Amino acid sequence: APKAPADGLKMEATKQPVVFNHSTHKSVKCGDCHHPVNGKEDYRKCGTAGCHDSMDKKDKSAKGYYHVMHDKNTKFKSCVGCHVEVAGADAAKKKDLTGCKKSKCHE
Numbered sequence: 001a002p003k004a005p006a007d008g009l010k011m012e013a014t015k016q017p018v019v020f021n022h023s024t025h026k027s028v029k030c031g032d033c034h035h036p037v038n039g040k041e042d043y044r045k046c047g048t049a050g051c052h053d054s055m056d057k058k059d060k061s062a063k064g065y066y067h068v069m070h071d072k073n074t075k076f077k078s079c080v081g082c083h084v085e086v087a088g089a090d091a092a093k094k095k096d097l098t099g100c101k102k103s104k105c106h107e
């Protein structure tokens with residue numbers, strides 16, 4: 001579809017922004033994150049209206065923006081959900097990839 005963006009993209013819908021780099025995610029297919037919607041992968045921003053636009057962090061339905069980035073019981077893998085699988089039981093990878101503070105997502 002469109003060309004992937006350069007690294008250094010800041011996701012900043014909340015008070016805890018995170019930088020997302022496509023280059024470090026080259027082993028994952030585009031469509032595993034810009035997931036199919038009605039049979040076609042969608043490339044719009046995750047928080048676009050009508051998409052995951054509920055900014056209530058206690059909302060764990062599919063509309064919750066915090067939920068889609070962090071939770072494990074999801075239909076497509078979230079940021080944290082896939083990272084738990086990648087980090088396994090290695091303390092260094094868990095710190096960098098899944099920690100809530102002092103990790104590569106949240107300083």
Ligand code: HEM
Nearest residue numbers: 002003004005011020025028029030033043044045046047
């Ligand atoms: C695969 C090479 C692939 C493509 C192509 C791609 C495209 C893409 C675009 C065009 C954007 C910008 C969207 C906008 O309107 O700002 C964008 C942004 C994000 N991407 Fe992506 N992307 C590809 C692959 C992947 C992979 C493998 C993941 C998941 C690991 C992923 C995730 C994201 C995220 C998150 C964003 C930011 C969205 C937001 O709401 O800010 N992309 N991508």
Ligand code: HEM
Nearest residue numbers: 033034037042044045046051061062068074075076077078
């Ligand atoms: C932006 C790259 C983006 C992410 C991240 C994302 C994640 C995501 C997850 C983890 C789920 C599962 C939720 C659960 O509780 O099981 C999920 C599901 C749906 N999504 Fe999504 N999503 C991103 C992008 C978009 C966009 C741009 C839209 C709006 C067109 C959208 C919509 C949906 C819908 C609909 C679902 C439900 C699944 C279904 O049955 O179709 N997402 N998303």
Ligand code: HEM
Nearest residue numbers: 018020021024027028032033077078079082083086104105
């Ligand atoms: C969800 C949008 C999401 C975010 C945010 C994210 C962040 C992230 C960081 C900060 C790193 C470290 C490298 C860097 O600074 O770019 C990293 C690395 C890996 N990720 Fe990730 N990631 C998000 C989503 C996902 C998803 C959905 C998957 C799996 C489906 C995934 C996987 C990976 C992998 C693999 C790595 C590299 C690990 C390594 O080389 O040690 N991420 N991600």
Ligand code: HEM
Nearest residue numbers: 011012013014015016017018069079080097098099100105
């Ligand atoms: C550890 C499990 C952990 C916690 C706790 C956590 C919390 C957190 C908060 C409070 C926010 C802001 C929510 C709001 O609406 O104010 C937030 C935002 C994002 N996070 Fe997070 N987070 C934890 C861990 C991780 C990890 C390991 C990553 C990267 C894989 C990650 C990612 C994200 C993303 C993306 C966002 C949204 C950024 C934005 O758009 O502002 N979190 N997190």
